[PDB]
Ligand binder design. Structure first.
Ligand SMILES: O=C(c1ccc(Br)nc1)N1CC2(CCN(C/C=C/c3ccc(Cl)cc3)CC2)c2cc(F)ccc21
Length: 393
């Protein structure tokens, strides 16, 4: 009667993990489908008409979650994770039907800002629930790996099919049925789940290990903040490939991501205290790919540079997300809202700055200077990550 209840608890953990991963897949599906659609009002290149009045609408999501997350930390610390996860999925459903319902400028602005309001609860609550229900060390990294695999699926293989299903039927019908799948997911989490003073955000940042992880997340995420709104209009200047071979450059860069997650999980189960060197080895190929992209004149080298660039983010963001939970475990009290709020500030400070200044600094100086500067930053972020020789003690 003890093993029976234990198997029931294992089933109750797995049926919540799968539902959280499907919700994250659908969320990144939304974030990657709606990007070519906004400047309109067979595949589609991401960005067009990059100016000051539309890039601020593309960065409205990131600037609103950057403004919300320092207050949305303690709401997850005091309360549970089920309640902010349901609030995030509810306002994400409202935003998803709002994209289908309207076609103005300010209404699309409100629909893009409600996605930031939805992310700033749902994403941090999902990663906090995954880090809560797996207290032991290898299962934490394994659940992190499965979550990153579903997020990389829903953010990499989703645009070249979302565009070609957007061209045929129109806007309204696919976003209505996808919002129906989102409400079905939220109702199924309701039917399954049935719903410590903590430490403030004012002193988490002064902890230097939290600070170096927070710097590493921004520095590893910002090349995909500056290369996504730029490379599509740059392909037509050097080689000028066809439109199928311009928006599908990030599609073969998914299998090296999941193989990189598989590699660092399987060889972090062996060595427990080498995650800092996995992070440095991830930043190595991040900097190498961000240096080697403009040299790739043909299309297949420019695909293999992007698959190296997607390999590196897999290594870094699988090596440093369980490290952050272990760090807030063995150095502070065991709460998981504020430190992943710090992580989301570190993600969003790149995405709130990329699509505003990227096209203007390409038009002012050039694309190769941007690439060499970011590769210079990722290669010079080596002595800063030598501070993590003490987390195994
Ligand atoms: O395309 C985007 C994107 C999405 C939204 C917006 Br707005 N802009 C861009 N991304 C983001 C990113 C997504 C995955 N990582 C962050 C995940 C943190 C996280 C959150 C919850 C959980 Cl449970 C576990 C982990 C790193 C970055 C990524 C990796 C790739 F290999 C390729 C592309 C992308």
């Amino acid at each position: 009667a003890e093993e029976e209840k234990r198997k029931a608890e294992e089933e109750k953990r797995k049926l919540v993990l799968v539902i959280v991963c499907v919700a994250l897949l659908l969320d990144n599906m939304l974030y990657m489908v709606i990007v070519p659609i906004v400047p309109d009002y067979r595949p589609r290149y991401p960005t067009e008409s990059e100016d000051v009045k539309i890039g601020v609408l593309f960065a409205s999501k990131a600037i609103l979650q950057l403004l919300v997350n320092p207050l949305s930390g303690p709401f997850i610390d005091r309360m549970s994770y089920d309640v902010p996860l349901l609030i995030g999925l509810g306002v994400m459903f409202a935003s998803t039907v709002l994209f289908a319902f309207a076609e103005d400028y300010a209404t699309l602005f409100a629909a893009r800002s409600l996605q930031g309001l939805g992310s700033a609860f749902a994403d941090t609550s999902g990663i906090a629930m995954i880090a809560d229900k797996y207290p032991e060390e290898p299962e934490r990294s394994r659940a992190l790996g499965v979550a990153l695999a579903f997020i990389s699926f829903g953010s990499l293989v989703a645009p070249p099919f979302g565009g070609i299903l957007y061209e045929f039927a129109g806007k309204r019908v696919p976003f209505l049925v996808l919002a129906a799948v989102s409400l079905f997911d939220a109702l199924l989490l309701l039917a399954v789940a049935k719903p410590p003073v903590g430490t403030p955000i004012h002193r988490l940042m002064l902890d230097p290990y939290i600070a170096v992880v927070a710097g590493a997340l921004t520095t590893c995420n910002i090349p995909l903040a500056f290369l996504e709104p730029t490379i599509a209009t740059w392909m037509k200047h050097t080689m000028a490939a066809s439109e199928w071979e311009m928006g599908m450059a990030w599609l073969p860069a998914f299998v090296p991501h999941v193989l990189g997650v598989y590699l660092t999980v399987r060889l972090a189960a062996r060595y427990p205290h080498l995650q800092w060197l996995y992070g440095a080895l991830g930043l190595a190929v991040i900097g190498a790919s961000s240096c080697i992209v403009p040299a790739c004149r043909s299309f297949a080298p420019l695909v293999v540079s992007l698959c190296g660039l997607c390999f590196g983010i897999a290594l870094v963001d699988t090596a440093l997300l369980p490290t952050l939970a272990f760090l807030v475990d063995v150095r502070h009290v065991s709460v998981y809202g504020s430190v992943y709020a710090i992580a989301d500030i570190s993600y969003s400070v790149a995405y709130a700055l990329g699509p505003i200044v990227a096209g203007h600094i390409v038009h002012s100086l050039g694309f190769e200077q941007l690439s060499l500067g970011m590769g210079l930053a990722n290669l010079l972020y080596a002595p800063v990550l030598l501070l993590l020789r003490n987390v195994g003690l």
